[PDB]
Amino acid sequence: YEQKVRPCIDLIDSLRALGVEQDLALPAIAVIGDQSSGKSSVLEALSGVALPVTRCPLVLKLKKQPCEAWAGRISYRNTELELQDPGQVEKEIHKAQNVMAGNGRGISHELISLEITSPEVPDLTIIDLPGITPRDIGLQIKALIKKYIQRQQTINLVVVPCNVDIATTEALSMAHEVDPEGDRTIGILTKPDLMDRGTEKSVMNVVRNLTYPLKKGYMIVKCRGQQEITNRLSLAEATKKEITFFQTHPYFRVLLEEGSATVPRLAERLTTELIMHIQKSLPLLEGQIRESHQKATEELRRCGADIPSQEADKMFFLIEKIKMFNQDIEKLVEGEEVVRENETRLYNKIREDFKNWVGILATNTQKVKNIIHEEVEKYEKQAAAAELLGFVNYKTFEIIVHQYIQQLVEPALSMLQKAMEIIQQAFINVAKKHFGEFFNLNQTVQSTIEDIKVKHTAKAENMIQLQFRMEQMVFSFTEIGIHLNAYFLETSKRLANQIPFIIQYFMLRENGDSLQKAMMQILQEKNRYSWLLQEQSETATKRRILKERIYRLTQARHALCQFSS
Amino acid sequence: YEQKVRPCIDLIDSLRALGVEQDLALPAIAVIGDQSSGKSSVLEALSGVALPVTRCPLVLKLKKQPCEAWAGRISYRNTELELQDPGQVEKEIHKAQNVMAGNGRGISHELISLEITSPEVPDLTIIDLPGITPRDIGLQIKALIKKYIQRQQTINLVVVPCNVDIATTEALSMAHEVDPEGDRTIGILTKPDLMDRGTEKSVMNVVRNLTYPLKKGYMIVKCRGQQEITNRLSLAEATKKEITFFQTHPYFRVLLEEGSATVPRLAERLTTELIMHIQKSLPLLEGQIRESHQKATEELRRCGADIPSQEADKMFFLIEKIKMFNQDIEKLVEGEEVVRENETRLYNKIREDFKNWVGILATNTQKVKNIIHEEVEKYEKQAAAAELLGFVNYKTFEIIVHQYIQQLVEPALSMLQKAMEIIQQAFINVAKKHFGEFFNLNQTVQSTIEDIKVKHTAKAENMIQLQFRMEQMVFSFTEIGIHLNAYFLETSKRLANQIPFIIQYFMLRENGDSLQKAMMQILQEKNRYSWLLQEQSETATKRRILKERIYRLTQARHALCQFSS
């Protein structure tokens, strides 16, 4: 019974006190209405005293204890003040409003928790939101209200004056916007004395009886006045006064007191609704706590390498990073890298390019085979029996061989270019992977990679050109054709193995080794470390936020464990 | 007749006057005899006046002309003095002897020409040689006389005293040594009064007649005395005195005056004999002139020099030399060099070394073939029972291949060493051929060759090591065996072509090109030219000698042409 419902709301109160209100939905009741709706007078009727316009949400926590009427104000600036008097409450509230908003009429999403424990106030926790009305100001108010009412865990409480058509009210309009079904919307009609025509009377009479699709229905209460702040009427006598009013009323007596009550059972209705709602939303709340904790933990696992700790753990950290980087580079060189689905390794791509090279060599081999075939076939029969000196050229075939070799120069260089490109790309990718968060270090590494790439490229091209220079400068009608064909085959093989050897050696092994040695060379300057390991200064703030979030969530789990016990 | 026979000896007199006595045989009559033979007294009896021991050869030229008594002394010191009086002649002659020999009893090959023209002395040219008998003295004397009597164009004139056994005389002994046939040996017997028995008379008389195989025979004259300088006996009365002496002699009258005369008509007979001798040896003399001229001209042509008159035409010569050198170097590089019989070319030797390399590669190929064959065949079956744990071995075969490749490094380097050595040797040889006479230029060239050799050697070995590094760092029960065997074969071929390509390219082509370009670089410095083209300078002196020789020989040809006309 009572012993079940009190700690029930105490749990959620404790959760919001340490909220944990962010990044997850938390059960609450939001009071929404126009500035002239008089919702403050209703809150005054419930708590005993309220503001005579709020700028920031007021977390009204009411407790019913047969000890004494005591009140404590808790402010988001991590402060707490014991005023022990209802009168001082509104003044200190206004002080807090001045603190949070900025002395003037501003707006803030920061919470003011009002903890009032009294034997004359119903046990109920509800949240008061600022009144409605490019931009100007009211826009951010509607945004603030939307922040709450959009949640399914938030019960809408619309406050509507009796002297206005409820179907044209902005509060109920927004409530319908976020809840078209009306499954979590409660409507209270206030200021029944302020109306001045029978028209409004019967309109209220047909409104109290479900005409609008609100599952929770409607209730009608007396404002008790917002202008009479100092009169200070007792809650019991105020209740009796309201009962007297509705009972004396020609229409409202029989039609309301028999059905939807007018007597301050509103707080009891809100109590029951809050209990049932919380009981409904508890499992998903626990689930979301665990899940959010997991996601925060993972996102935090993605970034954590920050602690320097007297430079030693920092230089050691740098050593670790460079070590891992060099390891991955070595993996790239050896072809022992981890790739994604349908993704191929660098070394394999390079091997494909080598296959292309082999194909080209075969093509040109057959070509020059045909060429020298026709040459030998022709000039061995040319002037076969002419008395001259002879013997129809011999130095000439060498320039044919020269053509055969020369045609291979540019394709090889092109292959070298491609290899250097893709390898460069891979190295840059690794450099980005290991040094993403660190901009300066990444710049240094990439610059180094660029330089070494250029140097080894020059070396490789020089060695290729050297190879071709060596190939050129060094040396029964169709016997010669056979000889030269054999020569072409052997040369084809020799090049087919030689050029990929050069490309692999200079672009993979030597490049990788030089890169690693340069990486080791980097950490030689100690006083440069701080410049190297400079974070974004955005990831740090994010890290702090995630850490605080996780801490708060662990506190939530702890409190939940206490409640379950 | 006479007018024809006089220029016959006048020719040889003119030839020796401009001699051209060196490097060829020249018709002459050499006077040889012992120091105590008294040959000087014989020369005094023949010419009218003589020395009262000669140290240098005396070219006695006697002319019979009905003009006037004239005497002229011609000395090898390029001097000439006309004293026209016998006393001053004999006084100046010993002075000349002192000048040429060195004041003391020395020896010299320098000539003293004595030109005596008188209507009472026979026309005859003869040469007086020093008397016979560390070092001490006689060895070079006998050598000097031998230098003359060895010639077939030289008539021997031996002077032997009557009071001594002619068969034990050294002069006639040497005459027999150089003329065993006795076809050009004449014997004069002197001092017949010094004998003191009839035995020596008859023995000498029967010995001269029919005992020696001398074609020219023997003749006997009176010494006329060497001690009676102040008596001054008339030539006619001396002749009549000699005739009286031989007529009064018991044996000499009938046996000599009837046959081999004793009156100084001997010199006229010697004149005729000289005529016939010169006429006999003239064609071969002309031949020797032609041969010596041709050989001197050719020997001078074998060397081209100097030849800088000035700065122009000198540098151009250097350009030519460097051009030819570079041409020969290019010949070495292309393998288009000229070699001697049974001599091989550098390129061919290098190719042989390459064949050795191929053989080694074949050996190691078969080696690793057998090894991997046994490895795959055995260790794939060497399981405990059924292999259900592996995954046998794969890195092992990789290190086997790696070792197989590594083993080939040192032989290749050795081959490179050998090639660089022999090529260096060849280049140095060419440098020596083109720059033999020029020391400094040769030094510069050889130094350059050394430096370039070292550099390209470093390049070559670096490229070989690079190649092997590329070979290493880059890669039906006996399928693995098949694959690896194919790989070994292809690798074997590839290396077999690659390493000789590197060695040949760097040691022949690049070395040669760098060398030639350096040779072109040499002539950039002008002020170095004179330093570069530095003669032996012994070759300059040799050239001077050859030039003088050629000029003198042309003079000889001129005089001979005058004689022929």
Side-chain angles (χ1 to χ4, degrees), chain A residues 94-117:
Chain A
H94 169 64
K95 290 184 179 180
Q97 295 287 333
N98 292 338
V99 173
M100 292 180 176
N103 300 326
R105 188 180 295 271
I107 185 172
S108 178
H109 293 202
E110 301 171 303
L111 302 180
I112 301 178
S113 175
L114 180 56
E115 184 176 47
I116 299 179
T117 301

Side-chain angles (χ1 to χ4, degrees), chain B residues 372-438:
Chain B
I372 196 63
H373 177 69
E374 288 304 313
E375 284 292 324
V376 171
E377 177 67 22
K378 179 179 178 179
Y379 288 101
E380 285 296 326
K381 296 179 177 178
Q382 289 300 323
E387 185 176 358
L388 302 175
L389 302 178
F391 306 97
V392 202
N393 298 272
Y394 292 102
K395 182 62 171 180
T396 305
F397 296 155
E398 291 192 2
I399 207 61
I400 293 172
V401 175
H402 176 77
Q403 291 175 341
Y404 165 72
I405 299 171
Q406 188 60 43
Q407 293 300 318
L408 303 171
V409 174
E410 294 300 321
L413 294 178
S414 298
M415 175 168 57
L416 174 62
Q417 178 67 23
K418 185 177 181 181
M420 90 91 175
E421 286 181 14
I422 53 178
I423 292 169
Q424 174 191 13
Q425 186 61 51
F427 283 9
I428 294 175
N429 292 343
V430 173
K432 180 59 177 176
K433 179 183 178 180
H434 284 268
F435 311 115
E437 186 179 11
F438 311 99

Side-chain angles (χ1 to χ4, degrees), chain B residues 212-274:
Chain B
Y212 293 114
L214 269 70
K215 185 177 179 180
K216 302 299 183 180
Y218 291 88
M219 290 191 65
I220 304 181
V221 298
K222 191 168 175 61
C223 52
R224 192 203 170 176
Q226 63 183 13
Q227 300 176 344
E228 299 180 20
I229 55 178
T230 323
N231 286 341
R232 298 177 58 189
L233 181 57
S234 179
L235 295 180
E237 297 180 358
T239 301
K240 187 176 182 179
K241 183 178 180 179
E242 181 171 7
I243 297 172
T244 301
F245 172 81
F246 280 99
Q247 187 173 349
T248 314
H249 194 281
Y251 294 94
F252 291 167
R253 180 188 67 259
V254 177
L255 292 181
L256 283 68
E257 193 171 359
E258 182 180 356
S260 179
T262 69
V263 51
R265 301 181 182 277
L266 157 65
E268 301 177 354
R269 301 181 60 175
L270 291 181
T271 294
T272 300
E273 291 294 335
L274 184 59

Side-chain angles (χ1 to χ4, degrees), chain A residues 334 347 351 463 466-467 469-471 473-475 487 490-491 493-494 497-498 500-502 504-506 509-510 513, chain B residues 347 351 463 466-467 469-471 473-475 487 490-491 493-494 497-498 500-506 509-510 513:
Chain A
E334 291 291 336
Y347 189 75
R351 286 189 65 86
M463 288 300 103
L466 175 61
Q467 179 63 34
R469 284 197 301 272
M470 290 188 300
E471 292 292 336
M473 296 302 299
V474 182
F475 297 100
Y487 173 77
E490 292 293 336
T491 302
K493 300 177 183 181
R494 180 173 61 259
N497 287 274
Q498 186 68 18
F501 279 4
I502 298 173
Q504 284 190 49
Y505 182 80
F506 281 99
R509 176 50 58 185
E510 291 299 319
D513 290 352
Chain B
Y347 188 75
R351 286 189 65 86
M463 288 300 103
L466 175 61
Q467 179 63 33
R469 284 197 301 272
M470 290 187 184
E471 292 292 336
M473 296 302 299
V474 183
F475 297 101
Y487 173 77
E490 292 293 336
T491 302
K493 300 177 183 181
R494 179 173 61 259
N497 287 328
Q498 186 68 18
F501 279 4
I502 298 172
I503 295 176
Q504 181 174 340
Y505 180 80
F506 281 99
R509 176 50 58 185
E510 291 299 319
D513 290 352

Side-chain angles (χ1 to χ4, degrees), chain B residues 422-491:
Chain B
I422 53 178
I423 292 169
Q424 174 191 13
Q425 186 61 51
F427 283 9
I428 294 175
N429 292 343
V430 173
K432 180 59 177 176
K433 179 183 178 180
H434 284 268
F435 311 115
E437 186 179 11
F438 311 99
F439 175 76
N440 295 333
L441 185 52
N442 183 273
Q443 290 297 326
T444 300
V445 169
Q446 289 184 1
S447 179
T448 297
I449 292 174
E450 181 70 19
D451 297 340
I452 297 177
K453 180 202 75 178
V454 172
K455 296 177 183 179
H456 281 306
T457 306
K459 292 183 178 181
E461 62 167 348
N462 287 340
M463 288 300 103
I464 293 172
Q465 291 183 356
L466 175 61
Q467 179 63 33
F468 280 112
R469 284 197 301 272
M470 290 187 184
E471 292 292 336
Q472 292 177 0
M473 296 302 299
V474 183
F475 297 101
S476 299
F477 287 93
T478 58
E479 181 76 11
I480 303 173
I482 299 171
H483 303 172
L484 291 180
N485 282 337
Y487 173 77
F488 288 145
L489 183 60
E490 292 293 336
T491 302

